[PDB]
Write a protein that binds this ligand. Structure first.
Ligand SMILES: O=P(O)(O)c1ccccc1
Ligand SMILES: O=P(O)(O)c1ccccc1
Ligand SMILES: O=P(O)(O)c1ccccc1
Ligand SMILES: [Mn+2]
Ligand SMILES: [Mn+2]
Ligand SMILES: [Mn+2]
Ligand code: NA
Ligand code: NA
Ligand code: NA
Ligand code: NA
Ligand code: NA
Ligand code: NA
Ligand code: NA
Ligand code: NA
Ligand code: NA
Lengths: 513, 513, 513
C-alpha cells in the first residue's frame, strides 16, 4: 500500500559494464557488482538504453525534465536551464511526495530569476530549483570535503590532491596505486551515509529519493583495496583506429577531441594527451574504473540492507541508471563527447514493487533517459506532463514492449564554446551551428551535423563505427531514409506546452488525442 | 579584506536572560553564558531590541525580509509568505554571497508557486525559498532524528518521547530529571556539527552563515548534566497577578490564553493547564530553561574556537539574536503570544570585524528585528532594498544612535484561527479583525487592538503591565498621543515596492529623497 | 435574463452639484441634469459617497481595484500601479464579460513588466492593463484630437488652444466667452460617439462598458451655448477664509496649495494664482463648470435613448459616479488636493435592472469608491476577490444599509513630489512621510498626517472645516477616539492576498470566516 521510489543515478558508467548483460551474451563478466546483479535478477534490465545528450548538465536536464535537448535547451555544461520547464522535483510535489535528492544536478540557474552576481554562476552548475537537498556534493564538492574534515581527516592544501596516487614518488596518470583518501572517507561512502540518514529520518513513511553517486566519474583513482581489485590483463581491450591521425580523419569533431583531450581531466595532476595513452595504461585505467564501480555496488548493498531490514524492499520501485557513458579509450577518446555509442549507452534496471512479472528479463526495446521521469510519475499515480518527450516504461514491466513503441534510438550533442573547451574556431562555426543529432536501430546509425558532414554506419559489418558510408552513392537511399526518420522525429517533438488548448464557440477546451 | 557574516538565531530566548545586561544593572547573573559574554565584551549589546511579531513564522519572516508584519503578511504560523517579498537569501546572492542556512525558517510556501498537494503544506512551515540549506532541522525534525539514528542511538516509536523525563516512573511536566537523549546527540549538538562541517568545507573562503538553534524552545527538558545545572531557588520569580481570573480580567485576549494554554505544549507528554503551575514548578521550569541556554552557549564556544584557530574571528561580523521571547510563567502565560514585553523583547549583540570602537557598550536606542537584514547588507556593501521597513544598525557600532533614529518600539500580533489555536469564536471576531499593534518608549506602552479594547500602561509605576489606564479619562491626552504616534507609524510604513518611481517628460525616473 | 453593466465615470464632478439631493434638502437646484435626474428617480442616490483618494491616477486605481491607496500604492499621478493587484478588467473576464472601456485610467505601468524606454513612462499615465479600449482619450488626448482632425476641423498649432476663449482679444482665465471648439466636436461628443459605436456593435449581446467622460475636468471653458447657459449670480458662493493668509495658517499643506496653485492649470493660457480670484471670477468659473456638466448630461441622454429604443434599459445596471471632486474656489483652492470634503465627496447613483425596490431613495449610509468594483462583480454573479477593501452595495438596493455597515468614511492623500508639484522642500519632509488619512462621520472629522500636525473639526458647528480643534485640550478624548478608530481601520485593512490560506495536517486549506 505504501509506495517508495529509489532513483539511483551513478555518473559515467557504461552500459557494457553491466554483468547481467555480459553473462547473457556468453561474455566474461570481468567485474563484480552483486547488488546490481540482485536488481537484475528481481527486475527488468534494459539493454538498449541511452542518455539523450551529454555531459552531466544536459544529461541531467533530460533525465529530470523528460525533455530532449532540442526542448530543454540546457545544451552544455555552464548553459542555463530555462525555469519554464517542469522538472521531476516540482512534479513530485504535485503527487504529494517530497523530492529528496542526494548528489548533484549541475544546473545553471535561469538569469531572469536571480541576480547576475549569484555565486551559482561561478560554477559548472548547482542544485536544480524544486528539489529538497539532503546530501549535496555542493559546488567544488564542498559538502563532501567538509564532511571529510569534520570526520577528522587532514586534507591537503589543494583538496583534490587526495586523488593523487599514494606516495610522493608517484607519477600522475593511470596508476596501480591507491588514492590518498581511505575508503571510509570516500565520496561513495559520503553519499551512502546521507542516504542512510535520510531513510532513517523517514522512519517508514513513503519516500522518493534520488540517490546520486559521483563514481565512476574520474579521476580514475580508487581507495584501497579497490585500486588493486582488478588485473589490467582481464579488462576488455579499447577499440580504436590504427593511430590518432587515422582516427581523426573520420570527421572534424573527432579530430578536435582526439587533439584536445588532456590526461589531466581524467587523472589528478596528470600531463599529456589522452590519445597517446598506450594499451597497458588504458587497461590499468579500465581496471581502476571497475574498482570504482565495485565500490559503488558495495555501497548500494548497505542501502539495500536497510530497506531489507525495515521491510521496505517490496514496497519500493528501484530504478538504477547513469547520467551518461564514457569512451574509456575507445576511438582514442576519454570522456563523454561526440557521437559514439559508448558515450551515450547507459545501464537501466527497474525493479517494481512485489514479485516482478518479468523478473530477470533483458529488454531490447529502445529506451531513452527522457522515459524515466514519466515512468516515476505514472507509477505514483500522477498524470505525465503534456510537455514531456518521453513515455512511461511501466508497460515493459508487465506485458512488454508496446506495439507502437519507438523503433529508433535518438540522442543529441551540442559542442558550442564553453570556458574549458572551445571548438568553434577550429571548426569554423558559429555558436548556433555547433550541434548534431543521432538516430539508430539494430542495423544502421546516422549522425547528422547541423553544419559539418554527416556520418552513416552499417552496425552489422562495422559495429564500432570506423567506416563512414554517408558519402557513398550506393547508400543514398539508406541515408535518405534515416535523414527522413530523424526529420520526422524533429517535427513530432516540437514544444508541447500549450498545443493541446483550443478556443472555440464553447470556450476554452483541451484536445486529448 | 575578507568579510564573513555569522548570524546566530536562537529560539525563544528572553532579553532579560543576558548576563552582560544583568551585571550592568547590578543584578545577579543567575545563568552562565561565557561565550555570549565574550561577544558582549568585544561588541555592542542592544538592551531595547524587539521582534516585530511572534511566533516563529511571523518573527522569521520579519527577520529575513526586513518587513513589519503589516507588510510581509505571514501573520501566523501556517499562513503563506507571499513570494513577492525580497528575502535575505536572495539579497545575499545579489552581493555574491552564498546564503547558507542551518536550522529552520518555518515558512509556508506561496500557493501560487506550487501544487496544492505540496508536502510543505502539511507542516507548520518549511525552508524559505532562496536559502542554501546546509543543516536543516527539516519538518517534523526529520533531519535531526535521522542524524541521531545514524549515530547509532535507538529512538522510541514516537520520536519526541526522547524528551520525556528519564525513568518510566517520571511524571511529565516541569522536572528535575534529565531527558532521555544524551548530550552528544542533542539538537544543539546537531546544529553545531552542521556549522563546523560547513565552515570546514569553506576552508577560509568568505561566508555568510545563518546558524539557527532550536533551544531554548520547549520542551523544557535538558540532557544531563544541564537538567541539574541551576537550582530553582536561584531563578527570578515569575511575575503574575493574584490568580488566573484576576489576570484574565485585564483583556479578552489575556483570558483566552490564560484559559487555553496547555502544559503539554511546553513539557513532553504533560497534562493540565499552564496557568495552574505553582511557583516551585515555574522555578524548576526556569532552571531547566537556563540549562538549555547554557548548552547553546557551550556549543557556540565550539564554533567560536574554530573561527579563532583559523584566524577568522576578526574578519567576521557576528550577530547574536533570538526570533522571539517567552512568557516563562509571567502573567500566568507560557509561550510567545499576546502583547507583554517578555514575548517580544529579545537579545541582540553585534561584534564588528577587528577591534570594535564601542566594545562592551550597552545601547539603549530602540532597535527592531527588521533592522538586522539592512545591517547585514549594508555591511557587505550592498544597497538596502527600497521595500525594507528597518534601517542599518551600523551607525551604532561607530558613532552611536543617529539623531533621527526612531523614538518608539513597535510590534504586532495577529491571533486569527489556526489549526491548533482558534480564539475567534471566544472573542467574537472575524479573521481580518484579529490583530493588535504595540508602541512604547521608556515611559508608556500603548496596545491597540483592531476590534477589542485598547490597553495603556505607565511603565515607571507599572513596569509589569498590570494596570490598564486606557479607559481612565485623566489619561485621555496621553492615550491620544500614543494612538497618534502609532497611526503615523502606519502611514509611514505603507508598502514601498514601486513608490520611488516616476513617469514624466524625460521618461522613467526614480526619486531618492 | 441578459445582464448589462454601464459604469459612467465622469471627472471632477462634486457631490453637491447633484440636483436630486439639492431638491431633497429644499435648496435651489441651480443646474440642469435631466438625464442624471432620471437615474435618481429610478434608482438609489448615495449622498455620502467619497473617493478614497485623489487625483485621477490614485482615484481610478481605487475605483478599478476595490483597494484603498494604503494597499494599491499608486499614491500619486506618475507613480506606477503594481501589476499584482487584480483589477476590474481582469475580474470581468473571470465572469465572461469583455471589459470594454471608453475614456482613460491614467495608469503608470509596473516597471518590472516593460522596458524603461516604454513611451507610457513619458505621460501622466496610460490605459490600465486588462481593459479592452474602444474609445481612448489616449495620452496627450491624441485619440480625441485625431477624431477632431478627421472630422475636418482645423486645429491650432498647439492643440489645447482650442480651449482659449473665443476671440483674439480674449483674456485667458474665467470667461463669459465660448471655447474655440464647436459642440459637435467637443470631447463629450467624442466619448458619446464611441459609446454609441460600441453599443451598436454589440447588437444586443450582453455588455460591460466603462463610459468615461473628461468633463467637467478643466479647462473651465465650454462650447457654445453651454458657456452662457448659467448666470454667475445664480451660482453657490465659494466658501473661504477672510484672506489667503488666514486660510493658509490652518496647516502647512493648506499653505503650500494656497501659495502654489496657478490659474493656468484651470483655464487655458491663464496667468496668476488661483487664490487671488475674486468672487465674480469664481462665480463665472462655477457657471462654466455647470455648463460643462449639462453638456455631459445632454450626451448621456443620447446613450440612454439608444438603450431605450433597443429595449435594454431594464436589463442594464447603471452606475453613475465621478473619480473625485473639485474645490472650485473653496478654501482658496482649485483642484482636487488636500483634505477638504469638496475634493473627495462625489456623486453615486445606481439603477438596478427592472423596477427598483428603492426607486428615488436617497441613502445616507457611508459609501466609498472601493465599493463599486465589488458591487459590479456581485451583480454579475462573480465572487468578490479576497483582496478587495470594499464591499458590495447590492444590499442598499433592496433592504437597505446592512446592520454591520461601516460607521465612518475614510480617505487618503499622498503629496510626495511629482514633476509638476513638489511640496517636500517647503514642508521639510522625505518622500515616505508625505501622506494623510481622514476619518469622519455625521459629527466629527479627523485628519491625521504622517509627519505634520493633525486636524479635527466639529462638523455641526463648523461644517466648512475652518476651526481646527485637534490641539484643544478639551477635545483630547474625542481626538483620541477618532485616532483610535483610524488606527483600527489600518489594522483591519492590511493586505489580504494570501491571509486566508492555511497549512496543516490535512494539507492546504482556506478559512472563510
Ligand atoms: O559533466 P560531469 O559528469 O563531468 C560533472 C560536472 C560537474 C559535477 C559532476 C559531474
Ligand atoms: O513558532 P515556534 O517557535 O514554536 C516553531 C515552530 C516550528 C518549528 C520551530 C519553532
Ligand atoms: O488627475 P486628473 O483628473 O487631472 C487627469 C489626469 C490625466 C488625464 C485626465 C485626468
Ligand atoms: Mn556526469
Ligand atoms: Mn520560534
Ligand atoms: Mn480626474
Ligand atoms: Na570541467
Ligand atoms: Na571515408
Ligand atoms: Na523513406
Ligand atoms: Na504547534
Ligand atoms: Na481596570
Ligand atoms: Na499628539
Ligand atoms: Na498635470
Ligand atoms: Na487654531
Ligand atoms: Na475610544
Amino acid at each position: 500500500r505504501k509506495k517508495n521510489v529509489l532513483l539511483i543515478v551513478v555518473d559515467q558508467w557504461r552500459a557494457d559494464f553491466v554483468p547481467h548483460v555480459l553473462r547473457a551474451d556468453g561474455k566474461i563478466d570481468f567485474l563484480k557488482t552483486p547488488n546490481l546483479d540482485r536488481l537484475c535478477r528481481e527486475g527488468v534490465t534494459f539493454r538498449n538504453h541511452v542518455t539523450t545528450c551529454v555531459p552531466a548538465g544536459p544529461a541531467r536536464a533530460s533525465l529530470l525534465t523528460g525533455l530532449y535537448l532540442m526542448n530543454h535547451r540546457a545544451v552544455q555544461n555552464t548553459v542555463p536551464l530555462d525555469q519554464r520547464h517542469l522538472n521531476l522535483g516540482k512534479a513530485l510535489r504535485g503527487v504529494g511526495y517530497d523530492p529528496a535528492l542526494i548528489g548533484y544536478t549541475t544546473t545553471v540557474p535561469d538569469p531572469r530569476t536571480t541576480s547576475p552576481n549569484d555565486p551559482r554562476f561561478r560554477v559548472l552548475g548547482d542544485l536544480m530549483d524544486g528539489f529538497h537537498p539532503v546530501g549535496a556534493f555542493e559546488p567544488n564538492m564542498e559538502g563532501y570535503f567538509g564532511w571529510v574534515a569534520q570526520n577528522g581527516f587532514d586534507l591537503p592544501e589543494h583538496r583534490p590532491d587526495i586523488w593523487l596516487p599514494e606516495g610522493e614518488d608517484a607519477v600522475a596518470g593511470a596508476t596501480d596505486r591507491p588514492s590518498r583518501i581511505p575508503k571510509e572517507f570516500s565520496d561513495s561512502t559520503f553519499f551512502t551515509e546521507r542516504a542512510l540518514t535520510y531513510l532513517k529520518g523517514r522512519d517508514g513513511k513513503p519516500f522518493f529519493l534520488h540517490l546520486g553517486y559521483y563514481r565512476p566519474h574520474p579521476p580514475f583513482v580508487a581507495s584501497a583495496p579497490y585500486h588493486a581489485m582488478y588485473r589490467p590483463e582481464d579488462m576488455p581491450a579499447p577499440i580504436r583506429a590504427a593511430n590518432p591521425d587515422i582516427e581523426a580523419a573520420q570527421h572534424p569533431l573527432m579530430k578536435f577531441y582526439v587533439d584536445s583531450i588532456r590526461r589531466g581531466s581524467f587523472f589528478q595532476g596528470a600531463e599529456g594527451s589522452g590519445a597517446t595513452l598506450d594499451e597497458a595504461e588504458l587497461r590499468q585505467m579500465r581496471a581502476t574504473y571497475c574498482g570504482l564501480i565495485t565500490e559503488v555496488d558495495d555501497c548500494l548493498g548497505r542501502v539495500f540492507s536497510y530497506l531489507d531490514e525495515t521491510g521496505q524492499w517490496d514496497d519500493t520501485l528501484i530504478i538504477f541508471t547513469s547520467d551518461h557513458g564514457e569512451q574509456l579509450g575507445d576511438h582514442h577518446l576519454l570522456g563523454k563527447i561526440g557521437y559514439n555509442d559508448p558515450s551515450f549507452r547507459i545501464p537501466l534496471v527497474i525493479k517494481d514493487a512485489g514479485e516482478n512479472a518479468r523478473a530477470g528479463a533483458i529488454e531490447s526495446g529502445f529506451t531513452e533517459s527522457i522515459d524515466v521521469m514519466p515512468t516515476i510519475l505514472d507509477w505514483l499515480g500522477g498524470k505525465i506532463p503534456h510537455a514531456c518527450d518521453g513515455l512511461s516504461l511501466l508497460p515493459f514491466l508487465s506485458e512488454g514492449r508496446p506495439q507502437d513503441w519507438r523503433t529508433e534510438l535518438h540522442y543529441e550533442y551540442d559542442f558550442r564554446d564553453v570556458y574549458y573547451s572551445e571548438p568553434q574556431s577550429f571548426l569554423g562555426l558559429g555558436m548556433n551551428d555547433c550541434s548534431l543529432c543521432v538516430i539508430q536501430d539494430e542495423r544502421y546509425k546516422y549522425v547528422h551535423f547541423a553544419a559539418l558532414p554527416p556520418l552513416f554506419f552499417d552496425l552489422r559489418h562495422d559495429p564500432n563505427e570506423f567506416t563512414n558510408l554517408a558519402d557513398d552513392p550506393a547508400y543514398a537511399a539508406l541515408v535518405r531514409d534515416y535523414a527522413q526518420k530523424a526529420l520526422s522525429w524533429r517535427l513530432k517533438h516540437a514544444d508541447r506546452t500549450l498545443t493541446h488548448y483550443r478556443s472555440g464557440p464553447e470556450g476554452l477546451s483541451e484536445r486529448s488525442h
